[PDB]
Amino acid sequence: NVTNLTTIKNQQAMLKIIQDEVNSKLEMFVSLDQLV
Amino acid sequence: NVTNLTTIKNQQAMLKIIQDEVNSKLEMFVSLDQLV
Numbered sequence: 001n002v003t004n005l006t007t008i009k010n011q012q013a014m015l016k017i018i019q020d021e022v023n024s025k026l027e028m029f030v031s032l033d034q035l036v
Numbered sequence: 037n038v039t040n041l042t043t044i045k046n047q048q049a050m051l052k053i054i055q056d057e058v059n060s061k062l063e064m065f066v067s068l069d070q071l072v
């Protein structure tokens with residue numbers, strides 16, 4: 001039972017970092033859409 | 037054990053936000069593809 005709570009933590013941190021990574025690429029796709 | 041649930045609720049909220057943002061971007065991608 002301890003482990004799941006710990007996993008949820010580590011997974012929380014790793015989810016947060018990856019969810020921050022996607023946006024930077026996205027904005028350029030936004031700029032390309034504006035250009036087109 | 038209750039904390040694990042609270043952290044899991046935080047997981048669900050965070051993903052939710054991310055789940056949205058990505059859908060909002062994919063819609064504009066679809067619009068671009070149809071236009072091209």
Ligand code: NA
Pocket residue numbers: 029065
């Ligand atoms: Na794209």
